[PDB]
Write an enzyme that holds these catalytic residues in place. Sequence first.
Site, short mmCIF file in Angstrom:
data_model
loop_
_atom_site.label_atom_id
_atom_site.label_comp_id
_atom_site.label_asym_id
_atom_site.label_seq_id
_atom_site.Cartn_x
_atom_site.Cartn_y
_atom_site.Cartn_z
N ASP A 166 0.79 -1.22 0.00
CA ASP A 166 0.00 0.00 0.00
C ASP A 166 0.83 1.28 0.00
O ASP A 166 1.31 1.72 1.04
CB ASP A 166 -0.84 -0.09 1.29
CG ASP A 166 -1.93 0.93 1.44
OD1 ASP A 166 -1.94 1.88 0.63
OD2 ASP A 166 -2.81 0.85 2.33
N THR A 167 0.98 1.84 -1.20
CA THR A 167 1.84 3.04 -1.29
C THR A 167 1.17 4.24 -0.66
O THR A 167 1.88 5.23 -0.41
CB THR A 167 2.24 3.35 -2.74
OG1 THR A 167 1.03 3.54 -3.49
CG2 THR A 167 3.06 2.24 -3.37
N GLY A 168 -0.13 4.16 -0.40
CA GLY A 168 -0.85 5.22 0.30
C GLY A 168 -0.77 5.17 1.80
O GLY A 168 -1.39 5.98 2.48
C1 LIG Z 1 -6.69 0.99 4.25
C2 LIG Z 1 -6.56 0.59 2.75
C3 LIG Z 1 -7.03 -0.91 2.61
C4 LIG Z 1 -7.58 1.40 1.94
N1 LIG Z 1 -7.25 2.85 1.93
C5 LIG Z 1 -6.11 3.32 1.13
C6 LIG Z 1 -4.87 3.54 1.98
O1 LIG Z 1 -3.73 3.68 1.13
C7 LIG Z 1 -5.00 4.75 2.94
C8 LIG Z 1 -4.98 6.12 2.22
C9 LIG Z 1 -5.06 7.22 3.25
C10 LIG Z 1 -6.25 7.44 3.94
C11 LIG Z 1 -6.34 8.47 4.91
C12 LIG Z 1 -5.22 9.28 5.17
C13 LIG Z 1 -4.02 9.07 4.48
C14 LIG Z 1 -3.95 8.05 3.53
N2 LIG Z 1 -3.85 4.71 3.88
C15 LIG Z 1 -4.05 4.36 5.17
O2 LIG Z 1 -5.08 4.04 5.72
O3 LIG Z 1 -2.87 4.42 5.84
C16 LIG Z 1 -2.96 4.29 7.29
C17 LIG Z 1 -3.55 5.56 7.93
C18 LIG Z 1 -2.36 6.50 8.22
C19 LIG Z 1 -2.21 7.78 7.36
C20 LIG Z 1 -1.48 7.25 6.14
O4 LIG Z 1 -0.59 6.25 6.64
C21 LIG Z 1 -1.04 5.71 7.89
C22 LIG Z 1 -1.50 4.25 7.74
S1 LIG Z 1 -8.54 3.85 2.09
O5 LIG Z 1 -9.25 3.47 3.28
O6 LIG Z 1 -8.02 5.19 2.00
C23 LIG Z 1 -9.68 3.60 0.74
C24 LIG Z 1 -10.73 2.71 0.94
C25 LIG Z 1 -11.53 2.47 -0.20
C26 LIG Z 1 -11.27 3.10 -1.41
C27 LIG Z 1 -12.11 2.87 -2.65
O7 LIG Z 1 -11.61 1.77 -3.36
C28 LIG Z 1 -10.21 3.97 -1.55
C29 LIG Z 1 -9.39 4.24 -0.48
#
Ligand SMILES: CC(C)CN(C[C@@H](O)[C@H](Cc1ccccc1)NC(=O)O[C@@H]1C[C@@H]2CCO[C@@H]2C1)S(=O)(=O)c1ccc(CO)cc1
Lengths: 99, 99
Positions: free
Chosen positions: B25-27
């Site tokens: 997860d690059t996010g």
């Molecule tokens: C948890 C994943 C399985 C799904 N996420 C994408 C992640 O990269 C999601 C993206 C995001 C969300 C909010 C704030 C900053 C970044 N990072 C994530 O939770 O990371 C966690 C939360 C903290 C801040 C970022 O790094 C720390 C770890 S998500 O919930 O944002 C999401 C859910 C459904 C959809 C639609 O498909 C898109 C995005």
Amino acid sequence: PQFSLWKRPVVTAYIEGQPVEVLLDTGADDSIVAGIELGNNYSPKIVGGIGGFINTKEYKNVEIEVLNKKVRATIMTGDTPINIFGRNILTALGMSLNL
Amino acid sequence: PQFSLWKRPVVTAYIEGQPVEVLLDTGADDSIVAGIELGNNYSPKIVGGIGGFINTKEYKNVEIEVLNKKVRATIMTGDTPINIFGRNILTALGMSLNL
Ligand SMILES: CC(C)CN(C[C@@H](O)[C@H](Cc1ccccc1)NC(=O)O[C@@H]1C[C@@H]2CCO[C@@H]2C1)S(=O)(=O)c1ccc(CO)cc1
Ligand SMILES: [Cl-]
Ligand SMILES: [Cl-]
Ligand SMILES: [Cl-]
Ligand SMILES: [Cl-]
Ligand SMILES: [Cl-]
Ligand SMILES: [Cl-]
Ligand SMILES: [Cl-]
Ligand SMILES: [Cl-]
Ligand code: NA
Ligand SMILES: [Zn+2]
Ligand SMILES: [Zn+2]
Ligand SMILES: [Zn+2]
Ligand SMILES: [Zn+2]
Ligand SMILES: [Zn+2]
Ligand SMILES: [Zn+2]
Ligand SMILES: [Zn+2]
Ligand SMILES: [Zn+2]
Ligand SMILES: [Zn+2]
């Protein structure tokens, strides 16, 4: 381009001509953005992640310009704390995640 | 290895010997895993995702086996619906996003 992931991979995109900073996110199936209004022709859907769930509005065939490419893709709008370009857009751009 | 992103970049991993399904997860800044039991040697951390904030248990110097590599990295355990390996681990592994 290469993103080495030492930092968040965030870039400027133009959605329907509006600039937005977006996170290039392999952990997102779809794309979700806040702060832009795409209109009355949507399908409501709920998405979930860490911390819970949010209501979104799903829009099809949206003009997106990012990484010097132009694509048309599905975008959700909703009260997301960060704007996310998920795999539907990353694949449209020809991005890959490599080891 | 290469992840073309048409499907979720999910792999199996071991965390201190415990098998998990994880999303690359690059996010995600951090790596968050549910259900595993890593013991009482943790510090509380607060993590903000799409929906809001959760408490997590932060464990340092955890053995992780993934993609034929072994690294030591920080794992947080808590209530995430999908186990995610974020950039702290992706950088330890030497991964990148490419176009
Ligand atoms: C948890 C994943 C399985 C799904 N996420 C994408 C992640 O990269 C999601 C993206 C995001 C969300 C909010 C704030 C900053 C970044 N990072 C994530 O939770 O990371 C966690 C939360 C903290 C801040 C970022 O790094 C720390 C770890 S998500 O919930 O944002 C999401 C859910 C459904 C959809 C639609 O498909 C898109 C995005
Ligand atoms: Cl045009
Ligand atoms: Cl490689
Ligand atoms: Cl694929
Ligand atoms: Cl495939
Ligand atoms: Cl093992
Ligand atoms: Cl962090
Ligand atoms: Cl904290
Ligand atoms: Cl956080
Ligand atoms: Na309509
Ligand atoms: Zn145009
Ligand atoms: Zn332009
Ligand atoms: Zn709000
Ligand atoms: Zn390699
Ligand atoms: Zn595929
Ligand atoms: Zn082992
Ligand atoms: Zn699965
Ligand atoms: Zn964090
Ligand atoms: Zn820490």
